[PDB]
Design a protein around this motif. Structure first.
Motif, PDB file in Angstrom:
ATOM      1  N   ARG A   1      -6.497   0.114  -2.799  1.00 42.94           N
ATOM      2  CA  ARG A   1      -5.481   0.353  -1.778  1.00 42.94           C
ATOM      3  C   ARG A   1      -4.072   0.161  -2.322  1.00 42.94           C
ATOM      4  O   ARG A   1      -3.166   0.936  -1.997  1.00 42.94           O
ATOM      5  CB  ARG A   1      -5.716  -0.570  -0.583  1.00 42.94           C
ATOM      6  N   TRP A   2      -3.863  -0.867  -3.146  1.00 44.62           N
ATOM      7  CA  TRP A   2      -2.531  -1.156  -3.659  1.00 44.62           C
ATOM      8  C   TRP A   2      -2.103  -0.185  -4.750  1.00 44.62           C
ATOM      9  O   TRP A   2      -0.904   0.074  -4.898  1.00 44.62           O
ATOM     10  CB  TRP A   2      -2.467  -2.587  -4.187  1.00 44.62           C
TER      11      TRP A   2
ATOM     12  N   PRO B   1       0.863  -2.145   1.421  1.00 44.92           N
ATOM     13  CA  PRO B   1       0.794  -1.194   0.300  1.00 44.92           C
ATOM     14  C   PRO B   1       1.232   0.220   0.646  1.00 44.92           C
ATOM     15  O   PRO B   1       1.402   1.030  -0.273  1.00 44.92           O
ATOM     16  CB  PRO B   1      -0.686  -1.230  -0.091  1.00 44.92           C
ATOM     17  N   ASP B   2       1.422   0.547   1.926  1.00 49.11           N
ATOM     18  CA  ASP B   2       1.790   1.905   2.333  1.00 49.11           C
ATOM     19  C   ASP B   2       3.295   2.108   2.145  1.00 49.11           C
ATOM     20  O   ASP B   2       4.080   2.168   3.095  1.00 49.11           O
ATOM     21  CB  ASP B   2       1.367   2.161   3.771  1.00 49.11           C
ATOM     22  N   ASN B   3       3.688   2.223   0.881  1.00 48.40           N
ATOM     23  CA  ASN B   3       5.086   2.428   0.522  1.00 48.40           C
ATOM     24  C   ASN B   3       5.199   3.090  -0.846  1.00 48.40           C
ATOM     25  O   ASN B   3       5.695   2.486  -1.798  1.00 48.40           O
ATOM     26  CB  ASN B   3       5.845   1.100   0.528  1.00 48.40           C
TER      27      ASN B   3
ATOM     28  N   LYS C   1       4.416  -4.896  -2.761  1.00 51.51           N
ATOM     29  CA  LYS C   1       4.899  -5.420  -1.493  1.00 51.51           C
ATOM     30  C   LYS C   1       3.732  -5.942  -0.659  1.00 51.51           C
ATOM     31  O   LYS C   1       2.565  -5.856  -1.050  1.00 51.51           O
ATOM     32  CB  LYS C   1       5.684  -4.347  -0.739  1.00 51.51           C
ATOM     33  N   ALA C   2       4.069  -6.506   0.506  1.00 51.57           N
ATOM     34  CA  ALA C   2       3.049  -7.050   1.397  1.00 51.57           C
ATOM     35  C   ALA C   2       2.192  -5.948   2.004  1.00 51.57           C
ATOM     36  O   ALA C   2       0.972  -6.106   2.139  1.00 51.57           O
ATOM     37  CB  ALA C   2       3.705  -7.885   2.495  1.00 51.57           C
TER      38      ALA C   2
ATOM     39  N   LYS D   1      -2.144   3.700  -2.878  1.00 53.67           N
ATOM     40  CA  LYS D   1      -1.172   3.783  -1.780  1.00 53.67           C
ATOM     41  C   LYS D   1      -1.513   4.915  -0.813  1.00 53.67           C
ATOM     42  O   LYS D   1      -0.633   5.614  -0.308  1.00 53.67           O
ATOM     43  CB  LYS D   1       0.261   3.922  -2.304  1.00 53.67           C
ATOM     44  N   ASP D   2      -2.804   5.094  -0.554  1.00 54.67           N
ATOM     45  CA  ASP D   2      -3.297   6.161   0.304  1.00 54.67           C
ATOM     46  C   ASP D   2      -4.649   5.756   0.879  1.00 54.67           C
ATOM     47  O   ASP D   2      -5.590   5.509   0.115  1.00 54.67           O
ATOM     48  CB  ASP D   2      -3.409   7.470  -0.481  1.00 54.67           C
ATOM     49  N   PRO D   3      -4.770   5.639   2.206  1.00 54.58           N
ATOM     50  CA  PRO D   3      -6.082   5.324   2.803  1.00 54.58           C
ATOM     51  C   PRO D   3      -7.159   6.347   2.491  1.00 54.58           C
ATOM     52  O   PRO D   3      -8.313   5.972   2.240  1.00 54.58           O
ATOM     53  CB  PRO D   3      -5.775   5.275   4.307  1.00 54.58           C
TER      54      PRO D   3
END
Lengths: 69, 57
Positions: free
Chosen positions: B46-47, A67-69, A64-65, B50-52
């Motif tokens: 990051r992709w 990435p926090d998902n 997705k646009a 999925k966690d900073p």
């Protein structure tokens, strides 16, 4: 009269035996049907009483646009 | 439920790119051409993570 018209007592006896066996099997199968319907409706892990849920094929697996998902 | 884990400010202290919008916008093409590989590494991390908290460094 017994020769021309009436059936033999053994014939009626064994016909009654077969009829009784068939009806006893039907009664046992009906009781098993009631028991299995009760048990597998209560547990809900059988082929019947399976209320539908959402199909998993419609989920998009692409990134997705954000990435926090 | 579980305690959410957070890194402290000691893992967050860096120098900052204290520049305006147009300063970044003017050299954005050479930005994308010259420093491309660390940017690609960071956003792939990051992709996929999925966690900073697993990409900060």
């Amino acid at each position: 009269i017994a020769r021309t018209f009436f059936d033999a007592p053994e014939k009626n006896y064994e016909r009654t035996m077969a009829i009784l066996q068939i009806e006893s099997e039907k009664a046992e199968l009906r009781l098993k049907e009631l028991e299995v319907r009760r048990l597998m409706r209560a547990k809900g892990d059988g082929p019947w009483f399976q209320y539908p849920t959402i199909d998993k094929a419609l989920i998009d697996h692409s990134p997705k646009a954000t990435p926090d998902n | 439920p579980g305690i959410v884990e957070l890194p402290s400010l000691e893992d967050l202290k860096v120098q900052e790119v204290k520049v305006s919008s147009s300063v970044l916008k003017a050299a954005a093409h050479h930005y994308g051409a010259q420093c491309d590989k660390p940017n690609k590494e960071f956003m792939l991390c990051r992709w996929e993570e999925k966690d900073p908290r697993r990409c900060l460094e």
